[PDB]
Design an enzyme around this catalytic site. Structure first.
Site, PDB file in Angstrom:
ATOM      1  N   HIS A  58      48.658 -34.196  13.794  1.00 11.86           N
ATOM      2  CA  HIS A  58      49.617 -34.039  14.783  1.00 11.86           C
ATOM      3  C   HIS A  58      48.695 -33.431  16.324  1.00 11.86           C
ATOM      4  CE1 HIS A  58      47.781 -30.103  14.283  1.00 11.86           C
ATOM      5  NE2 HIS A  58      48.125 -29.709  15.582  1.00 11.86           N
ATOM      6  N   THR A  87      -5.235   0.784   2.271  1.00 14.84           N
ATOM      7  CA  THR A  87      -4.513  -1.044   2.946  1.00 14.84           C
ATOM      8  C   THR A  87      -6.124  -1.553   3.931  1.00 14.84           C
ATOM      9  OG1 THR A  87      -2.702   0.321   3.953  1.00 14.84           O
ATOM     10  CG2 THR A  87      -3.153  -1.517   5.139  1.00 14.84           C
ATOM     11  N   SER A 117       1.052  -1.618  -0.036  1.00 16.95           N
ATOM     12  CA  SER A 117       0.342  -0.158   0.501  1.00 16.95           C
ATOM     13  C   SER A 117       0.986   1.165   0.194  1.00 16.95           C
ATOM     14  CB  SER A 117      -1.020   0.082   1.286  1.00 16.95           C
ATOM     15  OG  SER A 117      -0.539   0.703   1.737  1.00 16.95           O
ATOM     16  N   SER A 146       1.271   3.658   1.973  1.00 16.55           N
ATOM     17  CA  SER A 146       2.579   4.039   3.622  1.00 16.55           C
ATOM     18  C   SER A 146       3.291   2.924   2.967  1.00 16.55           C
ATOM     19  CB  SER A 146       1.437   3.347   4.597  1.00 16.55           C
ATOM     20  OG  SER A 146       1.405   2.528   4.548  1.00 16.55           O
ATOM     21  N   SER A 158      44.099 -26.291  16.910  1.00 16.01           N
ATOM     22  CA  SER A 158      44.029 -27.125  15.640  1.00 16.01           C
ATOM     23  C   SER A 158      42.869 -29.028  15.639  1.00 16.01           C
ATOM     24  CB  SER A 158      46.067 -27.845  15.696  1.00 16.01           C
ATOM     25  OG  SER A 158      46.161 -28.160  16.679  1.00 16.01           O
ATOM     26  N   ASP A 181      48.125 -34.336   7.278  1.00 18.84           N
ATOM     27  CA  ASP A 181      48.039 -33.599   9.239  1.00 18.84           C
ATOM     28  C   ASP A 181      46.166 -34.120   8.795  1.00 18.84           C
ATOM     29  OD1 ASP A 181      47.795 -33.522  11.262  1.00 18.84           O
ATOM     30  OD2 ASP A 181      47.837 -31.449  11.161  1.00 18.84           O
TER      31      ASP A 181
HETATM   32 MN   LIG Z   1      -0.775   1.396   4.313  1.00 22.67          MN
END
Ligand SMILES: [Mn+2]
Ligand SMILES: *[C@@H]1O[C@H](CO)[C@@H](O[C@@H]2O[C@H](CO)[C@@H](O[C@@H]3O[C@H](CO)[C@@H](O)[C@H](O)[C@@H]3O)[C@H](O)[C@H]2NC(C)=O)[C@H](O)[C@H]1NC(C)=O
Ligand SMILES: *[C@@H]1O[C@H](CO[C@@H]2O[C@@H](C)[C@@H](O)[C@@H](O)[C@@H]2O)[C@@H](O[C@@H]2O[C@H](CO)[C@@H](O)[C@H](O)[C@H]2NC(C)=O)[C@H](O)[C@H]1NC(C)=O
Ligand SMILES: *[C@@H]1O[C@H](CO)[C@@H](O)[C@H](O)[C@H]1NC(C)=O
Length: 503
Positions: free
Chosen positions: A265, A95, A20, A22, A437, A319
């Site tokens: 490791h 609205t 709407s 607004s 790690s 590793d």
């Molecule tokens: Mn509105």
């Protein structure tokens, strides 16, 4: 009190976008952007979900109905939303929220008619309505009347409480009517259903709190919580703590309900796994839950002194280690596997075509010369790095020729940093500490988490909650085992655990 994310039944999500006058044209773009985020997120859980898209002013406009099977297709939902135009309502800019909610009512009536009131296909549907609006209804009469009508058709009371949520959210630079927002999205119990939020970042946080995922207890990979108000473990639920015999700690990642991925490791004492312990996340305590190890597989190529005849005192090729826990982990908000690239699991997480390959996944995930990524700190917090790729990988790894402790005899960088490693640590990156790690190096795409590497070694340990950099040689720089380079070995041991794609 919340939207339920679960495997059983079905979720119908209705997005109602106030178009709407607004709501300015830019305010509406913020609405479309918020809708897209909620759609993308709701689809990341791989649950059964249909999404309706409605824009409304004086009249409602249905861009996607749940009676359309396309509403279960994320692609078609996102396009119908992006097709939404502000000027669609140019002839009636008032609205009428009642009319928009009645549109949803007529939708429900029609689907219930379609499937059959008495069928489980209809009974099993849960309904969530979200209005993006400033709350300033001015025609059509009372929205509450349409909400009463929806509640009637859906059979809502205390028992069937969970089958309808209505939210009303004002996002953006809006003049919001708070009283009206609260009429639309009244409280269920204590849970707020009306919000005023500044932007789509705030919405994203708030939407995480609108979703109940506690019942999602299968082994779906790479699902996290992206609220700041969630615990560290909920944010990275794959994350585990490793305790070798040595009393030093490492981190690791759940990659299925029984297997943990970590750094080789971490286990210096050797190969006696029955002295090791793993702490996985647990909802009942922040201590997590301790698991023993059924078996350990340390990559056969790992040997920290392999190149020591060449004056290289630590070498971290290969590793990587796999631990099978003595029991299956119970999947929950604090314990989930991370996604491993090059699996069907990860391919679905990425919403990719069927016949994708590992090369494809590498290309999608490590898509740039600088790729933003993460690892988890000792205190559990999520830290930021940038993986340096292609031509930039070379200049990133070059500074190791300045290391004074590990390599007094080094005539060749590629003897210590091979193609097996990702590289970060430049500019304003965080650097992992030794205790961090083994932990995942991970990326986030489509609201899912993907482990691309693991923390191996670096030139500078900031922990040598508390952390410190400096400005002298050599500069911080960190090298992570690249999971895309470790595929053969991973497939050998996880082939009956995950479903790997063609290479
Ligand atoms: Mn509105
Ligand atoms: C992201 O993490 C947050 C924080 O944990 C999740 O919000 C939480 O959701 C749970 C699950 O329903 C709520 O549990 C309830 O707690 C109340 C106590 O306040 C209790 O009365 C109920 O019996 C129930 O156990 C919890 O309240 C709620 N916490 C907050 C701060 O809102 C959120 O659901 C997570 N979202 C995602 C997408 O994973
Ligand atoms: C906005 O309305 C115009 C005008 O439509 C006419 O007047 C309205 C109040 C209503 O009573 C309609 O029945 C009338 O047709 C729309 O422009 C018309 O669009 C139609 C169909 O696309 C087309 O056949 C005509 O060329 C247009 N009519 C006239 C006389 O301009 C316009 O599409 C509406 N905007 C929307 C809904 O997006
Ligand atoms: C965890 O460590 C990080 C890394 O420096 C720090 O920024 C953060 O504040 C810590 N969290 C705390 C203080 O609990």
């Amino acid at each position: 009190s919340k939207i339920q994310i679960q495997r059983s039944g079905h979720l119908n999500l209705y997005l109602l976008l106030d178009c709407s006058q607004s709501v300015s044209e830019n305010d509406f773009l913020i609405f479309k952007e918020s809708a897209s985020l909620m759609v993308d997120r709701i689809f990341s859980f791989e649950i059964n979900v249909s999404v309706a898209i409605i824009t409304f002013a004086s009249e409602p406009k249905v861009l996607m109905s749940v009676l359309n099977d396309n509403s279960r297709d994320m692609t078609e939902v996102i396009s119908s939303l992006e097709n939404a135009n502000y000027k669609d309502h140019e002839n009636g800019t008032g609205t009428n929220t009642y009319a928009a909610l009645n549109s949803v009512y007529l939708m429900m009536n029609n689907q219930m008619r379609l499937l059959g009131m008495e069928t489980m296909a209809w009974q099993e549907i849960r309904h969530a309505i979200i209005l993006l609006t400033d709350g300033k209804s001015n025609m059509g009469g009372s929205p509450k009347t349409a909400v009463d009508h929806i509640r009637e058709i859906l059979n809502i009371n205390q028992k069937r409480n969970d089958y309808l949520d209505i939210y009303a959210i004002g996002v953006g630079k809006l003049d919001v009517d708070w009283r009206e927002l609260n009429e639309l999205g009244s409280k269920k119990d204590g849970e707020r259903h009306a919000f005023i939020l500044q932007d789509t970042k705030a919405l994203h946080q708030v939407f995480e709190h609108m979703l109940d995922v506690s019942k999602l207890t299968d082994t779906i990979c790479g699902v996290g919580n992206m609220s700041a108000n969630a615990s560290d473990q909920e944010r990275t639920p794959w994350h585990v703590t490793i305790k070798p015999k040595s009393q030093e700690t490492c981190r690791g990642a759940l990659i299925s309900d029984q297997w943990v991925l970590t750094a080789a490791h971490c286990f210096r004492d050797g190969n006696d796994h029955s002295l090791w312990r793993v702490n996985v996340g647990d909802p009942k305590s922040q201590w997590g839950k301790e698991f023993l190890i059924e078996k350990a597989v340390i990559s056969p190529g790992f040997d920290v002194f392999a190149k020591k005849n060449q004056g290289i005192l630590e070498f971290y090729g290969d590793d990587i280690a796999l631990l099978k826990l003595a029991q299956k982990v119970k999947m929950s908000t604090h314990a989930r596997p991370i996604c491993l690239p090059c699996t069907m699991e990860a391919n679905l997480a990425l919403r990719r075509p069927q016949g994708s390959t590992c090369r494809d996944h590498e290309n999608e995930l490590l898509n740039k010369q600088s790729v933003p990524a993460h690892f988890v700190a000792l205190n559990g917090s999520k830290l930021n790095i940038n993986l340096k790729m292609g031509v930039e990988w070379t200049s990133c790894a070059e500074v190791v020729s300045q290391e004074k402790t590990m390599f007094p005899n080094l005539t060749d960088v590629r003897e210590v940093v091979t193609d097996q490693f990702l590289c970060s640590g430049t500019q304003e990156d965080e650097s992992p500490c030794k205790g961090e790690s083994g932990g995942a190096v991970f990326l986030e795409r489509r609201f899912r988490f993907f482990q691309v590497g693991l923390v191996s070694w670096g030139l500078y340990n900031p922990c040598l909650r508390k952390r410190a950099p400096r400005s002298k040689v050599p500069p911080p720089r960190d090298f992570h085992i690249n999971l895309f380079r470790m595929q053969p070995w991973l497939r050998q041991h996880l082939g009956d655990v995950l479903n790997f794609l063609p290479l």
